[PDB]
C-alpha cells in the first residue's frame, strides 16, 4: 500500500484553514485505520488522530479527520503559530493480505503573515583562537525575519565573493513565526590577512534596500 | 508505559548493526512493537514489528535489509544486515502504531559513511558593536569541522533558552560538519551576565565549555 499526500506543503494565515488530502492506494482496515500525526523539529511525531476521525486525548478539537476507505483529509481550523510541524497520514491494514503500516510522504505545515519582518543582521570577525589554527571563518547571522526569501552577499575589498561560502536557515519559529539565517564565509589565514574590508549585504522584502555590515580586519 | 531506543552509532558501509528497543511498564506478549525511520530531512518509513503472538511482519522493502527480533522478556533487537549510505536516518521503535496504547520512543541516530570520526573545534562568536542592534546584542558559538551528527548545544548549563538559534550543520566541501549556535541578549548584560555555550560531541568524547565575552 502506498499513501500519497497533497500537497506536499501547505501555507495558512494565523486564524485560516488548511486541508491536507491523503489518498491509500488500498483501502485502509475496517475502511478507517488511517491515523494522522504530527512532528515537530527535533522531536518524535505525536499521534493527533486515529480511526480517521477520533482525536487523540488531549489534542486540540482544532483538527478535524475525516474520509474512509481510500481517501481521507485532515482539517486544521483557526490555525495557530504553533501548528508548524510536518504531517503525515498512516494506514494500517489486515498483515496477511497487505503491508501491515505505511506512511503517507509528509505534508509541511507553514504559517504565513501579511505583514513582513526585516532581519537584524549582525557580522562577527573569526576569532583569534581560529587564526592560530591557520583558518578564517567570517559569520554573518540574519535574526528573527519574514518571508523566508532572502539574499545574502559576501563582498571582500568590495569583490563579489562566489563558491567559499554556506549557509543554514531555522525551521520556522513556532511562536513568532519567522526564519533566521547564518551565512559563514571560510578563507584560509593567508587570504584573510590580504584584505582589508569584509562585508556582508543583506536583501529581503522587509528591508527598503539592502543593508549591509561590515568590519575592517584588524582595526 | 515508555519505550527507548539505543545502539545507533556510525559505521562503515557493509558493516552490520544491531538496534535495541527496551520496554517499562508492560509486557511484550501484550502489546505489539513497531520500527519506523526517518532519513534527514525525509519521511516517516515502517520498517517492520512483532505481533502479541511473536509472528514478525516487515515492509517488502526492509526484507533481508533488517532482521527484527524478541531478544530478551524486556528488549527487541533491529540488526541491520548489510547497511548502505541511504540507511542513515533516526530510528524509532514504538509500542502500536495505530491504536490508543501507541507510545514512541526518541529514536536513536544511525550513520553510514567511510568518513572518519572527528571532534569539533569551538569558537567564540564575540558580541561587539557589529552585533549590536537597538539595545539587543549578538554572541554565540561556532562548532566546526565535525563527524558524524549529532552535536548538542545549551546556553548557561540549559538556564538560558529564549532568543538562542542552533542552526541546522552544514556539510563542508571537506566532508565534515559545521553549525552555529547564536543568542540575542540585552546588550545592557554584556558586562554582568556570563555566557557559556555548552558543546557536546558524543561520537569524539568531546565537551566543551566555552565563556563567550566582548572582544577586546
Known amino acids: 500500500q502506498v499513501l500519497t499526500q497533497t500537497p506536499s506543503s501547505v501555507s495558512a494565515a494565523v486564524g485560516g484553514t488548511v486541508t491536507i488530502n491523503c489518498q491509500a492506494s488500498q483501502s485502509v482496515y475496517n475502511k478507517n485505520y488511517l491515523a494522522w500525526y504530527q512532528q515537530k523539529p527535533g522531536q518524535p511525531p505525536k499521534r493527533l488522530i486515529y480511526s480517521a476521525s477520533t482525536l487523540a486525548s488531549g489534542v486540540s478539537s482544532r483538527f478535524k479527520g475525516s474520509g474512509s476507505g481510500t481517501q481521507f483529509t485532515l482539517t486544521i481550523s483557526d490555525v495557530q503559530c504553533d501548528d508548524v510541524a510536518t504531517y503525515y497520514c498512516l494506514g494500517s491494514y489486515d498483515c496477511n493480505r497487505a503491508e501491515c503500516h505505511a506512511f503517507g510522504g509528509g505534508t509541511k505545515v507553514v504559517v504565513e503573515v501579511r505583514t513582513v519582518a526585516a532581519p537584524s543582521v549582525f557580522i562577527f570577525p573569526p576569532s583569534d583562537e581560529q587564526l592560530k589554527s591557520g583558518t578564517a571563518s567570517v559569520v554573518c547571522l540574519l535574526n528573527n525575519f519574514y518571508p523566508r526569501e532572502a539574499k545574502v552577499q559576501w563582498k571582500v575589498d568590495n569583490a563579489l565573493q562566489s563558491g567559499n561560502s554556506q549557509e543554514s536557515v531555522t525551521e520556522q519559529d513556532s511562536k513568532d513565526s519567522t526564519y533566521s539565517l547564518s551565512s559563514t564565509l571560510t578563507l584560509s589565514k593567508a587570504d584573510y590577512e590580504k584584505h582589508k574590508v569584509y562585508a556582508c549585504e543583506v536583501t529581503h522584502q522587509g528591508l527598503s534596500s539592502p543593508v549591509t555590515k561590515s568590519f575592517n580586519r584588524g582595526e | 508505559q515508555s519505550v527507548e531506543e539505543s545502539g545507533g552509532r556510525l559505521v562503515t558501509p557493509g558493516t552490520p548493526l544491531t538496534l535495541t528497543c527496551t520496554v517499562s511498564?508492560?509486557?511484550?506478549?501484550?502489546?505489539?512493537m513497531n520500527w519506523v525511520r526517518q532519513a534527514p530531512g525525509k519521511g516517516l518509513e515502517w520498517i517492520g514489528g512483532i505481533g502479541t503472538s511473536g509472528n514478525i511482519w516487515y515492509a517488502s522493502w526492509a526484507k533481508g535489509r533488517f532482521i527484527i527480533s524478541r531478544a530478551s522478556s524486556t528488549t527487541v533487537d533491529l540488526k541491520v544486515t548489510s547497511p548502505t549510505t541511504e540507511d542513515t536516518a533516526t530510528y524509532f521503535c514504538?509500542?502500536?502504531?495505530?491504536?490508543?496504547?501507541?507510545?514512541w520512543g526518541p529514536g536513536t541516530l544511525v550513520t553510514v559513511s567511510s568518513a572518519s570520526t572527528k571532534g569539533p573545534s569551538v569558537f567564540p562568536l564575540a558580541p561587539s558593536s557589529k552585533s549590536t542592534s537597538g539595545g539587543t546584542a549578538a554572541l554565540g558559538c561556532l562548532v566546526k569541522d565535525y563527524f558524524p551528527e549529532p552535536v548538542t548545544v545549551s546556553w548557561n548549563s540549559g538556564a538560558l533558552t529564549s532568543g538562542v538559534h542552533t542552526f541546522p550543520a552544514v556539510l563542508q566541501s571537506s566532508g565534515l560538519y559545521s553549525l552555529s549556535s547564536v543568542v540575542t541578549v540585552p546588550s545592557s548584560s554584556l558586562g554582568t551576565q556570563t555566557y557559556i555555550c555548552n558543546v557536546n560531541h558524543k561520537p569524539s568524547n568531546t565537551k566543551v565549555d566555552k565563556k563567550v565575552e566582548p572582544k577586546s
Open positions: 514504538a509500542r502500536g502504531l495505530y491504536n490508543d496504547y501507541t507510545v
Open positions: 511498564g508492560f509486557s511484550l506478549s501484550s502489546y505489539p
